[PDB]
Coordinates of C-alpha atoms (C1' of nucleotides) and ligand atoms in Angstrom, one line a residue:
Chain A
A1 CA 8.8 14.1 26.2
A2 CA 12.5 13.5 25.6
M3 CA 13.8 10.0 25.1
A4 CA 16.3 8.4 27.6
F5 CA 19.7 7.4 26.3
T6 CA 23.3 7.3 27.3
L7 CA 25.6 9.8 25.6
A8 CA 28.6 7.6 25.8
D9 CA 32.2 8.9 25.8
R10 CA 33.5 5.4 25.1
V11 CA 32.4 2.0 23.8
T12 CA 31.2 -0.6 26.2
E13 CA 30.3 -4.4 26.1
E14 CA 26.6 -4.0 26.2
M15 CA 26.8 -1.7 23.1
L16 CA 28.0 -4.8 21.2
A17 CA 25.0 -7.2 21.6
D18 CA 24.2 -9.6 18.8
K19 CA 21.1 -7.6 17.7
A20 CA 20.5 -3.9 17.6
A21 CA 19.0 -1.1 15.7
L22 CA 22.0 0.8 14.3
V23 CA 22.2 4.4 13.0
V24 CA 25.4 5.6 11.2
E25 CA 24.3 9.1 10.1
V26 CA 25.5 10.8 6.9
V27 CA 23.6 14.0 6.3
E28 CA 25.3 14.9 3.0
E29 CA 22.9 13.7 0.2
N30 CA 25.8 12.3 -1.8
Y31 CA 27.3 9.9 0.8
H32 CA 30.5 9.2 -1.1
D33 CA 33.6 10.0 1.0
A34 CA 31.2 12.0 3.2
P35 CA 31.3 12.5 7.0
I36 CA 29.5 10.3 9.5
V37 CA 28.1 12.9 12.0
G38 CA 27.1 10.5 14.8
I39 CA 26.1 7.0 15.7
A40 CA 23.2 5.6 17.6
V41 CA 22.7 2.1 18.9
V42 CA 19.6 0.6 20.6
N43 CA 19.4 -2.9 21.9
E44 CA 18.2 -5.1 24.8
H45 CA 20.5 -3.2 27.2
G46 CA 19.3 0.3 26.3
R47 CA 19.9 3.2 24.0
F48 CA 23.2 4.8 23.2
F49 CA 24.8 7.6 21.2
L50 CA 28.5 7.5 20.2
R51 CA 30.7 10.2 18.6
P52 CA 32.0 8.9 15.3
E53 CA 35.6 9.7 16.1
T54 CA 35.3 7.6 19.2
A55 CA 33.3 4.6 18.0
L56 CA 35.1 4.3 14.6
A57 CA 38.5 4.4 16.2
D58 CA 37.5 1.7 18.7
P59 CA 38.8 -1.8 17.7
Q60 CA 35.9 -3.5 19.4
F61 CA 33.2 -1.4 17.7
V62 CA 34.8 -1.8 14.3
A63 CA 35.0 -5.6 14.8
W64 CA 31.3 -5.6 15.9
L65 CA 30.4 -3.7 12.7
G66 CA 32.1 -6.3 10.6
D67 CA 30.8 -9.3 12.5
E68 CA 28.2 -11.0 10.3
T69 CA 26.8 -12.8 13.4
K70 CA 26.0 -9.5 15.1
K71 CA 22.7 -8.5 13.5
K72 CA 21.8 -5.0 12.7
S73 CA 18.5 -3.3 11.7
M74 CA 18.9 0.0 9.9
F75 CA 17.4 2.5 7.5
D76 CA 19.2 2.8 4.2
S77 CA 22.2 0.6 5.2
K78 CA 23.7 1.1 1.8
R79 CA 24.4 4.8 2.7
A80 CA 26.2 3.7 5.9
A81 CA 28.0 0.9 4.2
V82 CA 29.4 3.0 1.4
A83 CA 30.3 5.9 3.9
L84 CA 32.2 3.2 5.9
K85 CA 33.9 1.6 2.8
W86 CA 35.5 5.0 2.2
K87 CA 36.9 5.0 5.7
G88 CA 38.2 1.4 5.2
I89 CA 35.6 -0.1 7.5
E90 CA 33.3 -3.0 6.6
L91 CA 29.7 -3.3 7.7
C92 CA 28.2 -6.8 7.9
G93 CA 25.2 -8.5 9.5
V94 CA 22.4 -6.1 8.3
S95 CA 19.4 -8.4 8.7
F96 CA 16.7 -5.7 8.2
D97 CA 16.6 -2.5 6.2
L98 CA 13.5 -0.3 7.0
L99 CA 13.9 1.8 3.9
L100 CA 13.7 -1.3 1.6
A101 CA 10.9 -2.8 3.8
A102 CA 8.8 0.3 3.4
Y103 CA 9.6 0.6 -0.3
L104 CA 8.3 -3.0 -1.0
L105 CA 5.2 -2.5 1.1
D106 CA 4.2 0.6 -0.8
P107 CA 6.5 2.3 -3.4
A108 CA 4.0 5.1 -3.7
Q109 CA 4.5 6.5 -0.2
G110 CA 7.9 7.8 -1.3
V111 CA 9.4 7.0 2.1
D112 CA 12.8 8.7 2.3
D113 CA 13.4 9.0 6.0
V114 CA 12.6 7.0 9.2
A115 CA 9.7 9.2 10.1
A116 CA 7.9 8.5 6.8
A117 CA 8.2 4.8 7.3
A118 CA 7.2 5.0 11.0
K119 CA 4.1 6.9 10.0
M120 CA 2.9 3.8 8.1
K121 CA 2.5 2.1 11.5
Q122 CA 1.1 5.1 13.3
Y123 CA 4.5 5.6 15.0
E124 CA 5.3 9.3 15.3
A125 CA 7.8 9.5 18.2
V126 CA 10.5 10.6 15.7
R127 CA 11.0 13.7 13.6
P128 CA 11.5 13.9 9.8
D129 CA 15.1 14.5 8.9
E130 CA 14.2 17.7 7.1
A131 CA 12.8 19.1 10.3
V132 CA 16.0 18.4 12.2
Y133 CA 18.6 19.2 9.5
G134 CA 16.6 21.7 7.4
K135 CA 17.1 21.9 3.7
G136 CA 19.1 23.6 1.0
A137 CA 21.0 26.6 2.2
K138 CA 19.6 26.2 5.7
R139 CA 20.6 22.5 5.7
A140 CA 23.0 21.9 8.6
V141 CA 23.9 19.5 11.4
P142 CA 22.5 20.7 14.7
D143 CA 24.3 20.8 18.1
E144 CA 25.1 17.5 19.8
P145 CA 22.1 17.6 22.2
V146 CA 19.6 17.8 19.3
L147 CA 21.6 15.5 17.0
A148 CA 22.0 12.8 19.6
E149 CA 18.3 12.8 20.5
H150 CA 17.3 12.6 16.8
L151 CA 19.6 9.6 16.0
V152 CA 18.5 7.8 19.1
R153 CA 14.8 8.2 18.3
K154 CA 15.4 6.9 14.7
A155 CA 17.2 3.9 16.1
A156 CA 14.4 3.4 18.6
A157 CA 11.8 3.6 15.8
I158 CA 13.7 1.0 13.7
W159 CA 14.0 -1.2 16.7
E160 CA 10.2 -1.0 17.4
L161 CA 9.1 -1.2 13.7
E162 CA 11.0 -4.2 12.4
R163 CA 8.6 -6.8 13.7
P164 CA 5.4 -5.2 12.3
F165 CA 7.1 -4.5 8.9
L166 CA 8.4 -8.1 8.6
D167 CA 4.9 -9.4 9.6
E168 CA 3.1 -7.4 6.9
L169 CA 5.8 -8.3 4.3
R170 CA 5.1 -11.9 5.3
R171 CA 1.3 -11.5 4.8
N172 CA 2.1 -10.0 1.4
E173 CA 4.4 -12.9 0.6
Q174 CA 7.2 -10.3 0.2
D175 CA 9.4 -11.5 3.0
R176 CA 11.9 -13.4 0.7
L177 CA 11.7 -10.4 -1.8
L178 CA 13.3 -8.3 0.9
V179 CA 15.6 -10.8 2.6
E180 CA 16.8 -12.7 -0.5
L181 CA 16.6 -10.1 -3.2
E182 CA 16.6 -6.4 -2.2
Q183 CA 18.8 -6.6 0.9
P184 CA 21.5 -8.7 -0.7
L185 CA 21.3 -6.5 -3.8
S186 CA 21.9 -3.4 -1.6
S187 CA 25.3 -4.8 -0.7
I188 CA 26.1 -5.4 -4.3
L189 CA 25.1 -1.8 -5.3
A190 CA 27.3 -0.5 -2.5
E191 CA 30.3 -2.3 -3.9
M192 CA 29.5 -1.0 -7.4
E193 CA 29.1 2.6 -6.3
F194 CA 32.2 2.5 -4.2
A195 CA 34.2 1.0 -7.1
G196 CA 33.1 3.7 -9.5
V197 CA 33.7 4.0 -13.2
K198 CA 37.0 5.4 -14.6
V199 CA 36.6 8.4 -16.9
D200 CA 39.0 9.6 -19.6
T201 CA 38.7 13.3 -18.8
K202 CA 41.2 14.3 -21.5
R203 CA 39.0 12.5 -24.0
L204 CA 35.9 14.3 -22.7
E205 CA 37.7 17.7 -22.7
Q206 CA 38.8 17.2 -26.3
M207 CA 35.3 16.2 -27.4
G208 CA 34.2 19.3 -25.5
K209 CA 36.3 21.6 -27.6
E210 CA 35.1 20.1 -30.8
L211 CA 31.5 20.5 -29.7
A212 CA 32.1 24.1 -28.6
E213 CA 33.3 24.7 -32.1
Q214 CA 30.5 23.0 -34.0
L215 CA 28.0 24.4 -31.5
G216 CA 29.4 27.8 -32.4
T217 CA 29.0 27.4 -36.1
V218 CA 25.4 26.1 -35.9
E219 CA 24.7 29.0 -33.5
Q220 CA 25.8 31.7 -35.9
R221 CA 23.9 30.0 -38.7
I222 CA 20.7 30.2 -36.7
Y223 CA 21.1 33.9 -36.1
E224 CA 21.8 34.2 -39.8
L225 CA 18.6 32.4 -40.8
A226 CA 16.5 34.2 -38.2
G227 CA 17.9 37.6 -39.2
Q228 CA 18.9 38.5 -35.6
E229 CA 20.2 37.1 -32.3
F230 CA 18.3 35.4 -29.5
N231 CA 18.5 32.8 -26.8
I232 CA 17.9 29.6 -28.7
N233 CA 17.7 27.8 -25.3
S234 CA 14.8 30.1 -24.4
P235 CA 11.7 28.2 -25.5
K236 CA 9.9 31.6 -25.1
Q237 CA 12.3 33.5 -27.3
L238 CA 12.4 30.6 -29.8
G239 CA 8.6 30.5 -30.1
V240 CA 8.5 34.2 -31.0
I241 CA 11.2 33.8 -33.7
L242 CA 9.7 30.7 -35.2
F243 CA 5.9 31.5 -35.0
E244 CA 6.0 35.3 -35.1
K245 CA 9.0 36.6 -37.0
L246 CA 9.2 33.7 -39.5
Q247 CA 5.5 33.0 -39.5
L248 CA 6.0 29.2 -39.2
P249 CA 2.7 27.3 -38.7
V250 CA 1.5 26.3 -35.2
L251 CA 0.9 22.6 -35.1
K252 CA 1.1 22.2 -31.3
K253 CA 0.6 24.5 -28.3
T254 CA 2.1 24.0 -24.8
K255 CA 0.6 25.1 -21.5
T256 CA 2.4 28.5 -21.4
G257 CA 3.0 29.1 -25.1
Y258 CA 4.0 27.5 -28.4
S259 CA 5.5 24.0 -28.4
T260 CA 9.0 23.8 -29.8
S261 CA 9.5 20.1 -29.0
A262 CA 11.5 18.1 -31.5
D263 CA 8.4 16.2 -32.6
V264 CA 6.9 19.5 -33.6
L265 CA 10.1 20.9 -35.2
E266 CA 10.4 17.8 -37.2
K267 CA 7.2 18.7 -38.9
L268 CA 8.3 22.3 -39.4
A269 CA 11.6 21.4 -40.9
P270 CA 10.2 21.4 -44.5
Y271 CA 9.1 25.1 -44.1
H272 CA 12.3 26.8 -43.1
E273 CA 16.1 25.9 -43.0
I274 CA 16.3 27.2 -39.4
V275 CA 14.4 24.2 -38.0
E276 CA 17.1 21.6 -38.7
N277 CA 19.8 23.9 -37.3
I278 CA 17.7 24.4 -34.1
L279 CA 17.4 20.6 -33.8
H280 CA 21.1 20.0 -34.4
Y281 CA 21.8 22.8 -32.0
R282 CA 19.5 21.1 -29.5
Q283 CA 21.5 18.0 -29.9
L284 CA 25.1 19.3 -29.5
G285 CA 23.9 21.5 -26.7
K286 CA 22.5 18.5 -24.8
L287 CA 25.8 16.7 -25.1
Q288 CA 27.9 19.6 -24.0
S289 CA 25.8 20.6 -21.0
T290 CA 24.9 17.3 -19.5
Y291 CA 27.5 14.8 -20.8
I292 CA 30.6 16.9 -21.1
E293 CA 30.5 19.8 -18.6
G294 CA 27.9 18.1 -16.4
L295 CA 30.0 14.9 -16.3
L296 CA 33.3 16.6 -15.7
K297 CA 31.8 18.3 -12.7
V298 CA 31.3 15.0 -10.8
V299 CA 34.5 13.2 -11.7
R300 CA 36.7 12.7 -8.6
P301 CA 39.9 14.8 -9.5
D302 CA 42.1 12.4 -7.6
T303 CA 40.9 9.1 -9.1
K304 CA 39.2 10.3 -12.3
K305 CA 36.3 8.0 -11.4
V306 CA 32.6 8.9 -11.2
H307 CA 30.7 7.4 -8.3
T308 CA 27.0 7.1 -9.0
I309 CA 24.4 6.5 -6.3
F310 CA 21.7 3.9 -7.2
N311 CA 18.4 4.8 -5.7
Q312 CA 17.1 1.4 -4.8
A313 CA 13.8 2.6 -3.3
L314 CA 12.3 5.1 -5.7
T315 CA 10.7 3.8 -8.9
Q316 CA 7.1 2.5 -8.7
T317 CA 8.0 -0.5 -10.9
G318 CA 11.0 -1.9 -9.0
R319 CA 13.7 -0.5 -11.3
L320 CA 16.7 1.2 -9.9
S321 CA 17.5 4.9 -10.7
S322 CA 20.9 6.5 -10.9
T323 CA 22.2 10.0 -10.0
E324 CA 25.3 12.2 -9.6
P325 CA 25.8 11.3 -12.3
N326 CA 23.0 9.4 -14.0
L327 CA 24.8 6.5 -15.7
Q328 CA 21.6 5.0 -17.0
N329 CA 21.0 7.6 -19.7
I330 CA 24.4 7.9 -21.5
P331 CA 23.9 8.6 -25.2
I332 CA 23.9 5.6 -27.6
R333 CA 21.1 6.2 -30.1
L334 CA 22.8 8.9 -32.2
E335 CA 26.4 8.3 -33.2
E336 CA 27.6 11.8 -32.2
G337 CA 26.4 11.3 -28.6
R338 CA 27.4 7.7 -28.6
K339 CA 31.1 8.7 -28.7
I340 CA 30.5 10.0 -25.2
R341 CA 30.9 6.4 -24.2
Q342 CA 34.6 6.2 -25.3
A343 CA 35.2 8.3 -22.2
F344 CA 34.3 5.4 -19.9
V345 CA 37.3 3.2 -19.7
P346 CA 38.5 0.3 -17.5
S347 CA 39.9 1.4 -14.1
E348 CA 43.1 -0.7 -14.6
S349 CA 45.5 -1.3 -17.4
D350 CA 45.1 -4.4 -19.4
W351 CA 41.5 -4.6 -18.2
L352 CA 38.4 -4.3 -20.5
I353 CA 34.7 -3.3 -20.4
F354 CA 32.2 -6.2 -20.7
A355 CA 28.5 -5.5 -21.4
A356 CA 25.7 -8.0 -21.4
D357 CA 22.0 -7.2 -22.2
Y358 CA 18.8 -9.1 -22.2
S359 CA 17.2 -9.2 -25.6
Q360 CA 13.5 -8.2 -25.6
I361 CA 13.1 -9.2 -21.9
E362 CA 9.8 -7.3 -21.5
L363 CA 8.2 -8.9 -24.5
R364 CA 9.5 -12.3 -23.4
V365 CA 8.0 -11.7 -19.9
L366 CA 4.7 -10.7 -21.5
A367 CA 4.8 -13.9 -23.5
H368 CA 5.3 -15.9 -20.3
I369 CA 2.7 -14.0 -18.2
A370 CA 0.0 -13.8 -20.8
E371 CA 0.7 -17.4 -22.0
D372 CA 0.1 -16.3 -25.6
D373 CA 0.7 -19.2 -27.9
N374 CA 1.7 -17.2 -30.9
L375 CA 4.1 -14.9 -28.9
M376 CA 5.6 -17.8 -27.0
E377 CA 6.2 -19.8 -30.2
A378 CA 7.8 -16.6 -31.8
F379 CA 10.4 -16.4 -29.1
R380 CA 10.9 -20.2 -29.0
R381 CA 11.9 -19.8 -32.6
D382 CA 14.0 -16.7 -31.6
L383 CA 12.3 -14.7 -34.4
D384 CA 12.8 -11.0 -35.0
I385 CA 9.7 -10.1 -33.0
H386 CA 9.1 -6.9 -34.8
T387 CA 9.1 -8.5 -38.2
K388 CA 6.8 -11.3 -36.9
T389 CA 4.4 -8.7 -35.5
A390 CA 4.2 -6.9 -38.8
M391 CA 3.6 -10.2 -40.7
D392 CA 0.7 -10.9 -38.4
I393 CA -1.0 -7.5 -38.1
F394 CA -0.5 -6.8 -41.8
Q395 CA -1.1 -10.4 -42.9
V396 CA 1.8 -10.8 -45.2
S397 CA 4.8 -13.1 -45.6
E398 CA 8.2 -12.3 -44.2
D399 CA 9.4 -11.4 -47.7
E400 CA 6.6 -8.9 -48.0
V401 CA 7.5 -6.9 -44.9
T402 CA 8.7 -3.5 -45.9
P403 CA 10.9 -1.4 -43.6
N404 CA 8.1 1.0 -42.8
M405 CA 5.9 -2.0 -41.9
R406 CA 8.4 -3.3 -39.3
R407 CA 8.9 0.2 -38.0
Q408 CA 5.2 0.5 -37.2
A409 CA 4.9 -3.1 -35.9
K410 CA 7.9 -2.1 -33.7
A411 CA 6.0 0.9 -32.3
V412 CA 3.0 -1.3 -31.6
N413 CA 5.2 -3.7 -29.6
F414 CA 6.6 -0.8 -27.6
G415 CA 3.1 0.5 -26.9
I416 CA 1.7 -2.9 -25.9
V417 CA 4.3 -2.9 -23.2
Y418 CA 3.8 0.6 -21.8
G419 CA 0.1 -0.2 -21.9
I420 CA -1.4 0.3 -25.4
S421 CA -3.2 3.6 -26.2
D422 CA -4.8 4.5 -29.5
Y423 CA -4.0 8.1 -28.9
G424 CA -0.4 7.6 -27.7
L425 CA 0.3 5.2 -30.6
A426 CA -1.2 7.8 -33.0
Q427 CA 1.2 10.5 -31.8
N428 CA 4.1 8.1 -32.0
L429 CA 3.3 6.9 -35.6
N430 CA 2.0 10.3 -36.6
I431 CA -1.4 8.9 -37.7
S432 CA -5.1 9.2 -36.6
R433 CA -6.8 7.5 -33.7
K434 CA -9.0 5.3 -35.9
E435 CA -5.9 4.0 -37.7
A436 CA -3.9 3.5 -34.5
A437 CA -6.9 1.7 -32.9
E438 CA -7.1 -0.4 -36.0
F439 CA -3.5 -1.6 -35.6
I440 CA -4.1 -2.4 -31.9
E441 CA -7.3 -4.3 -32.8
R442 CA -5.3 -6.2 -35.5
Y443 CA -2.6 -6.9 -32.9
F444 CA -5.0 -8.3 -30.4
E445 CA -6.4 -10.5 -33.2
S446 CA -3.0 -12.0 -33.7
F447 CA -2.2 -12.3 -30.0
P448 CA -5.5 -13.2 -28.2
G449 CA -3.6 -14.3 -25.1
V450 CA -2.1 -10.8 -24.7
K451 CA -5.6 -9.3 -25.1
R452 CA -6.9 -11.6 -22.5
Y453 CA -4.1 -10.6 -20.2
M454 CA -4.7 -6.9 -20.6
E455 CA -8.3 -7.4 -19.8
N456 CA -7.7 -9.7 -16.9
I457 CA -4.9 -7.7 -15.3
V458 CA -7.1 -4.6 -15.3
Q459 CA -9.9 -6.6 -13.7
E460 CA -7.5 -8.0 -11.0
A461 CA -6.1 -4.5 -10.2
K462 CA -9.7 -3.4 -9.5
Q463 CA -10.5 -6.6 -7.5
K464 CA -7.4 -6.7 -5.4
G465 CA -6.4 -3.0 -5.5
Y466 CA -3.0 -3.8 -6.8
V467 CA -1.0 -5.8 -9.3
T468 CA 2.2 -7.8 -8.7
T469 CA 5.3 -9.0 -10.4
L470 CA 7.0 -12.4 -10.8
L471 CA 8.9 -12.1 -7.5
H472 CA 5.9 -10.6 -5.6
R473 CA 6.7 -6.9 -5.9
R474 CA 3.5 -5.0 -5.7
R475 CA 2.0 -1.7 -6.8
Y476 CA -1.3 -0.3 -5.5
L477 CA -3.5 1.4 -8.1
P478 CA -6.3 3.3 -6.3
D479 CA -7.1 5.4 -9.4
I480 CA -8.2 2.2 -11.2
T481 CA -11.7 3.0 -9.9
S482 CA -11.7 6.7 -10.6
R483 CA -14.8 7.9 -12.5
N484 CA -12.5 10.3 -14.4
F485 CA -11.7 8.7 -17.8
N486 CA -8.2 10.2 -18.0
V487 CA -7.1 9.3 -14.4
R488 CA -8.6 5.8 -14.7
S489 CA -6.9 5.1 -18.0
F490 CA -3.5 6.0 -16.7
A491 CA -4.0 3.5 -13.9
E492 CA -5.2 0.9 -16.3
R493 CA -2.0 1.4 -18.3
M494 CA 0.1 1.0 -15.2
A495 CA -1.8 -2.2 -14.3
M496 CA -0.8 -3.5 -17.7
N497 CA 2.7 -2.2 -17.6
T498 CA 4.0 -2.7 -14.1
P499 CA 3.9 -6.6 -14.1
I500 CA 6.0 -6.4 -17.2
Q501 CA 8.6 -3.7 -16.4
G502 CA 8.5 -4.9 -12.8
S503 CA 9.1 -8.6 -13.5
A504 CA 11.9 -7.6 -15.9
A505 CA 13.4 -5.6 -13.0
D506 CA 13.1 -8.6 -10.6
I507 CA 14.9 -10.9 -13.0
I508 CA 17.9 -8.6 -13.6
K509 CA 18.2 -7.9 -9.9
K510 CA 18.3 -11.7 -9.2
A511 CA 20.8 -12.1 -12.0
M512 CA 23.1 -9.6 -10.3
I513 CA 23.0 -11.5 -7.1
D514 CA 23.5 -14.9 -8.8
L515 CA 26.4 -13.4 -10.9
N516 CA 28.2 -12.0 -7.9
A517 CA 28.0 -15.4 -6.2
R518 CA 29.5 -17.0 -9.4
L519 CA 32.3 -14.5 -9.7
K520 CA 33.4 -15.2 -6.2
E521 CA 33.3 -19.0 -6.5
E522 CA 35.4 -18.7 -9.6
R523 CA 37.7 -16.2 -7.9
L524 CA 37.5 -14.0 -10.9
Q525 CA 38.6 -10.4 -10.5
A526 CA 35.8 -9.2 -12.7
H527 CA 33.2 -7.1 -11.0
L528 CA 30.0 -5.2 -11.7
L529 CA 30.1 -1.5 -12.5
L530 CA 26.7 -0.5 -13.7
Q531 CA 23.1 -1.8 -14.4
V532 CA 21.0 -0.1 -17.0
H533 CA 17.5 -1.7 -16.6
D534 CA 18.1 -4.6 -19.0
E535 CA 21.9 -4.7 -19.2
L536 CA 24.9 -5.3 -17.0
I537 CA 28.2 -3.6 -17.4
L538 CA 31.4 -5.1 -15.9
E539 CA 35.1 -4.6 -16.1
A540 CA 37.8 -7.3 -15.7
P541 CA 41.3 -8.4 -16.8
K542 CA 41.6 -9.1 -20.5
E543 CA 42.5 -12.7 -19.5
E544 CA 39.0 -13.2 -18.0
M545 CA 37.0 -12.2 -21.2
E546 CA 36.7 -15.7 -22.5
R547 CA 35.3 -17.1 -19.2
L548 CA 32.9 -14.1 -18.9
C549 CA 31.6 -14.7 -22.5
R550 CA 30.2 -18.0 -21.2
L551 CA 29.5 -17.1 -17.6
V552 CA 27.7 -13.8 -17.6
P553 CA 25.1 -14.8 -20.3
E554 CA 24.4 -18.2 -18.7
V555 CA 23.8 -16.7 -15.2
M556 CA 21.6 -14.0 -16.6
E557 CA 19.7 -16.4 -18.8
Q558 CA 19.1 -18.8 -15.9
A559 CA 18.2 -16.2 -13.2
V560 CA 14.5 -17.4 -13.5
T561 CA 12.8 -20.0 -15.7
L562 CA 10.0 -18.7 -17.9
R563 CA 7.7 -20.4 -20.5
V564 CA 10.0 -18.9 -23.2
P565 CA 13.8 -18.8 -23.3
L566 CA 15.7 -15.7 -22.0
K567 CA 18.3 -14.4 -24.4
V568 CA 21.4 -12.3 -23.6
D569 CA 23.7 -10.6 -26.0
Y570 CA 27.2 -9.5 -25.0
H571 CA 30.2 -7.6 -26.2
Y572 CA 33.5 -6.3 -24.7
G573 CA 36.1 -3.8 -25.6
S574 CA 38.6 -1.1 -24.7
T575 CA 35.9 1.4 -23.6
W576 CA 32.2 1.3 -22.9
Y577 CA 31.7 2.5 -26.5
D578 CA 33.6 -0.5 -27.9
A579 CA 31.6 -3.0 -25.9
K580 CA 29.3 -3.2 -28.8
Chain B
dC1 C1' 14.7 28.7 -4.2
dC2 C1' 10.4 25.8 -7.5
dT3 C1' 8.2 24.7 -12.2
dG4 C1' 7.8 24.2 -16.9
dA5 C1' 10.2 22.7 -21.3
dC6 C1' 13.4 20.0 -23.2
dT7 C1' 16.2 15.7 -24.3
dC8 C1' 18.9 11.5 -22.7
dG9 C1' 18.2 6.3 -21.5
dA10 C1' 15.6 1.5 -21.2
Chain C
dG1 C1' 5.5 3.2 -19.2
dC2 C1' 9.6 4.1 -15.8
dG3 C1' 13.5 7.5 -14.7
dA4 C1' 17.4 12.3 -14.2
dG5 C1' 19.8 16.8 -15.4
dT6 C1' 19.9 21.0 -17.9
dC7 C1' 18.2 25.6 -18.9
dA8 C1' 15.2 29.6 -18.6
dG9 C1' 11.9 32.2 -16.1
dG10 C1' 9.5 33.7 -12.0
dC11 C1' 10.3 33.9 -6.9
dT12 C1' 11.8 37.0 -4.2
Ligands
LIG1 O1 21.2 6.3 -1.2 C1 20.0 7.1 -1.6 C2 18.8 6.8 -0.7 O2 18.6 7.9 0.1 C3 17.3 8.6 -0.2 C4 16.7 9.1 1.1 O3 16.1 8.1 1.9 O4 17.7 9.6 -1.2 C5 18.7 10.7 -0.8 O5 19.9 10.4 -1.6 C6 19.9 10.4 -3.1 C7 21.3 10.2 -3.6 O6 22.2 11.2 -3.0 C8 19.2 11.8 -3.6 O7 18.9 11.7 -5.0 C9 17.9 12.1 -2.9 O8 17.4 13.4 -3.3 C10 18.1 12.1 -1.2 O9 16.9 12.4 -0.6 C11 16.5 7.4 -0.9 O10 15.6 7.9 -2.0 C12 17.5 6.5 -1.5 O11 17.1 5.1 -1.3
MG2 MG1 18.7 -5.0 -24.8

DNA sequence: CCTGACTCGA
DNA sequence: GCGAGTCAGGCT
């Protein structure tokens, strides 16, 4: 059942038509400075397989790659583009990306290879990558005969599937979402990843020594208070020491034993001095393992830069994710871990780190979408939304709002977003269900429009089978009809949450696209480095700071127009840490 | 070599 | 709500 194709030893004219399905294979998961093991091209003239050494050394092929008028259809073009950037080659003209097309059609499928996407249209004349390359220790590039056939079949699938995918996207009203948002964004993410972020490894290594010391003191202390020695990182050994040897009370049980989660230990703290030391130990240990040692492992020794990979087709809400390393979860909440950020510095001398973040974008989106008069007015007055919520649900004046009141109103606001739950709120505020449900009820009394939205969005999810975001991203919720209370409730929360988190993601993605267009028009040297859900991190010459102070916020605030204003705060400094 | 338990972020 | 990386423990 083999597929016909030419295993070319040299590049020819017909291989350079103005439309083709292109495959530039990089098997290494992390594609940075990784090898391109083969190339496949399928067009009106036929199917071809080219050896990378050959094709990439050919002036005509490289020019075709960089010709914006020569259209290419691909799967995960960002992977190819970055792999090519490292080789000094530019990839242009990608008009269709099957990975992004599949992702928008149904994020739930978890499409990560051509075979998975093809299966959505009953196309199975191609094998899953894992079948061909294997995985883990067994992972490996097969011989040319098998490799060449696999790449050709993938190119063939892409070539065949483009039309049906575009047609459905069109029916879904997601055609612009792919062509004007996700695809252009893919090119921006590639530039960001390729650029990387400079790390002050000596700073990290010094912080590492200090931690190793402190971690050592707290460690001995723990063995001293426990009366012996054990693996504190062993939740199994810890549970025995705490609940058996020290007789501490059991407030929460896990699935395999006792629960030693911070939320539990926080309640045990009063009973024994070892609990605080275990918590502190848990802190320092997290910083050392993940952010010191874990980070140092992925810094490029030659450039001292870390090159993350943004997974643009994974989250169910439209958000990006980041790996190797994850630069979207760098410490900031606790001062000790926040210092980790001093290690992220500008990649050039006399340059600075500029960070801009949307203020309460999710709640503002909710105000717009629900059209709640009270909430819209609150933002129109640019009020401290948490103080305002407390004033309403506790019926008091601004002056009568105590810190504890605001803290709880804040927790209610956070819950309303993730999809309110009396039980979930109860655990968060450490109170009973009735009490939590009382707050929620009081909240809905103050924000009737929000309540109406929650009810209406759940109904719509059941009527249509999915919910959507501002820019037409969708999420199917089959569980919404489940007769199992728990399963159904999770789906209902997703129905409430996705349009909020999802619309917030659409907005920042568009802002990134708009911002890049503005930076180019202005010929500014400033460029994007990272995106952290609701914030943008850039680096630029110190001479560009003043222009950025006006430009970045404006572009971000004007990305979309809502019934309430969009607000962006910004800071800049010598290091990421100082950009506060 | 996979899963549970933990903690980091928005 | 949505994510990723570490460790320990069981696989084997
Ligand atoms: O660029 C990432 C891109 O590739 C996919 C596979 O289609 O993920 C691969 O690469 C990631 C980064 O190296 C890994 O985290 C992941 O495990 C690997 O399969 C897509 O998820 C993504 O869009
Ligand atoms: Mg913010």
